[model samples]
Target chain A: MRILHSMLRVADLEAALEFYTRALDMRLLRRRDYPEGRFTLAFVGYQDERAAAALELTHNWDRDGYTQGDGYGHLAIEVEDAAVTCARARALGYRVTREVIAFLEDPDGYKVELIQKGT
Target chain B: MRILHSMLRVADLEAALEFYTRALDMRLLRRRDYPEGRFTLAFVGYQDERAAAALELTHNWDRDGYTQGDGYGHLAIEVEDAAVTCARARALGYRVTRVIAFLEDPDGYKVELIQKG
Candidate 1:
């Protein structure tokens, strides 16, 4: 058995997708709309579904926000270089929480530990 | 940049850890306590932190419960066989949600799509 993916509830699907795909360089693996359930599920990740684990972003059409309690933590992503990537992200107007800290922080105040990616 | 890990708030840290480690077969990567913050964080995953993504379980020592709101969803695990895994989990007294249906469910009644790992 292997770990396939983790799920998260997002307030805005389009905004979340844009952040992941455009800023984080992740791919939208699969998405399905459940009108009856009034929710949409989008899977995003670094590789194909058959290769790597992914993130499931669930958007409840009726919901516009979520209380990310203290019990909830942040997702950690590996980057080419923490300092360089964060600078670029800031220049692009992306929300930079912890400026070049050993760990990266998102606009939402979520800490994402940035490890130097492999060549 | 690459996606790393996601987080969840569990009611019982020990119970949740037992479920993930014994039932789901996840490894306990790292754990630390913040006395001043009154919370603890644990990292669990299927692979080494450097190789595969992980799940961050945050336990607020002061709080004993959490509301997993309707907007929240369940995690998906790839199993060699859904039927076999569910059956084994049930036998072990683990909470199984959707049973043998195309999707899997947990004791929490969360629908986890079974992709025939």
Candidate 2:
């Protein structure tokens, strides 16, 4: 078996898309609206659309906010360099977590780990 | 940037490990405990440990329960056949979600999607 994707609910689809695609450099793989459910699902990732594991962003139109409970943790992402990535993120007004390393919380308080790529 | 892993907090370490590894057929790549923080982290996946992505299971000593808020959704996993997977899961006393396709909620109330590979 293989992992297909991970899903997270967001309040604003466009805002979440911009943060993921622009700030994190993820590709907007695809998006579909569920009119009956009053929600939209947007897929984003670094690989192709058919790839097994991608990020699924679900936007429920009626919900205005969400409280990320303690059960859910961070989604780690690899970067060429953690220091450089943190610097760039700070320049873009993103807050880095106090983990003192690669792990940082985004504006939404979701932790994102930036690890240096291996040779 | 590439996704490395997704972390989730579990109430029982051994129970969760058994469910993911024995019931779901995932491999336990590695595990480490942070004594200072009173928590342990276990990595599980279908591929090698050094692979880009994995599932991180965090077990905190003090926490006994979790309220899976509406913000979090299910994690989709690919199987050779969704119908067969669901059948096996039901036989093992697992609960399948009402989504009617492949999504099922685990004992932890966390939704897991079993898609045909």
Candidate 3:
């Protein structure tokens, strides 16, 4: 079996779409709002879903907020320059969560880490 | 930028390794223990890291456990026969948490299995 995606519950789909698209340069691969299910699924990634694994964001209509539990860790992305992206996050009015390139928090407080492309 | 890996904290390294390697039939790409960091990092995937992103399981020496956050959902794995894999997971003496193709991990984290073939 191959990993297809990692799911995360988001509060606002639009805000999340903006965050990933603007901050990390990810493209919105596909999305669908299931009225009957009362939820929406948005897939985002750097390339086509077939080419790489995407991040799935689900927003339940009933749940306003959920606990950011300690168990599930952060989603890491490889970047050209972390310092530049981290600064861009700050400039974009996003949370510059930590200094060590360790705790990069997204709009929904989902932990994210930006690592340089190479070691 | 591309997602490199999703890091997860596991309490028992051997047990976790057994679960992933046997239950899901995934290859352990590489692993190394950082004595100074007091933690170990293990990479598992169906293909090479350069070909695709892999899952990162971090075993921290001090931390024995962690909260499986509400916000963090689960990891999805595309399989040929989900029923067969789910059965394999159950036969492996692992927790088949949800029958809709799900396996309960050691830390109680969920790994969703999707059908491809």
Candidate 4:
């Protein structure tokens, strides 16, 4: 058994996609729109789902936002260079931290921490 | 880059640890207590952090509960059998859904989806 993915509800799928793909350098693994359910799920990660755990973004077309609470903490990622990732995230207009242990908020204000690999 | 872990704030570290380690059959990979910080950190998963992405349960010593919002969904885990896992979870005093796509709540009401592998 393995960890599959951590799911998060997003208001704007495209905006979240751009932030994760362009800002965080993760690939869009898969996306499916359930017309009847009025929701769309997009999975993003550095590798395929079979190879690694990915992040699942669920977008309900009817809703605009969700009440984000403090119970859930940030989703962390191990990156080659924290500085480089933070720079790219800032260039893409995302709020990024300027520290060795850095973090940036996604379109839905979900914190994604970028930890420098091997340190 | 690789997805490391999804962190969740728990009220009780021991109860949370029991649910993950016993009910879910996950290993308590590493645990540490920060006396200065007045909190505990426990990592649990099917494998080590280097081998796979684990779950980080952070317990703040001062707090006992948190306002769990709906923005976040469940931490899904691939399992061998949905029925078997659900049964084990139920037997361990955890509420579980009896369906193909099953889910159970942890000590802090965090939903844990158990998908049949």
Output the number of the TM-score-best candidate: 4
What is candidate 3's lDDT per residue for B1-117, written digit by digit as tens? 788889888988888889989988889999999999999989988898777888999998998887766888899988888889888888888887742488888888899998974
lDDT of 3 at A21: 89
Off by over 4 Å in 1: A100-113, B33-39, B98-117
The interface root-mean-square deviation of each model, in the order shown, is: 2.4, 1.4, 1.2, 0.6
The residue-level lDDT of candidate 4 at A38 comes to 95
* Candidate 2 colliding pairs: A97-A104
For candidate 2 chain A, the 10 contiguous residues with the lowest summed lDDT are A98-107
Error of 2 at B22 (Å): 2.2
Please state the CAPRI-style docking class of candidate 3: high
Please provide TM-scores, in order, for all candidate models, with all chains considered together: 0.77, 0.91, 0.93, 0.94
What does DockQ give for each predicted structure?
Answer: 0.50, 0.76, 0.82, 0.91
Model number with the top lDDT:
3
RMSD of 2: 2.3
**Residue A40, candidate 2: how far off, in angstroms?**
1.0
Clashes of each: 1, 1, 2, 0
Q: Mind giving the per-residue lDDT tens digits that candidate 1 earns over B1-117? A: 556677776667787777777666789999999999988888887888777778778778777776544444566777767777666667777766532232332325242536463
Clash number for model 4?
0
Error of 4 at B21 (Å): 0.5
- Comparing only chain A of model 4 with the true chain A, what is the TM-score? 0.95
For B24-102, candidate 4 gives per-residue lDDT tens digits of 7889999999999998999999988887899999999999887888899888788777778877788888886543555
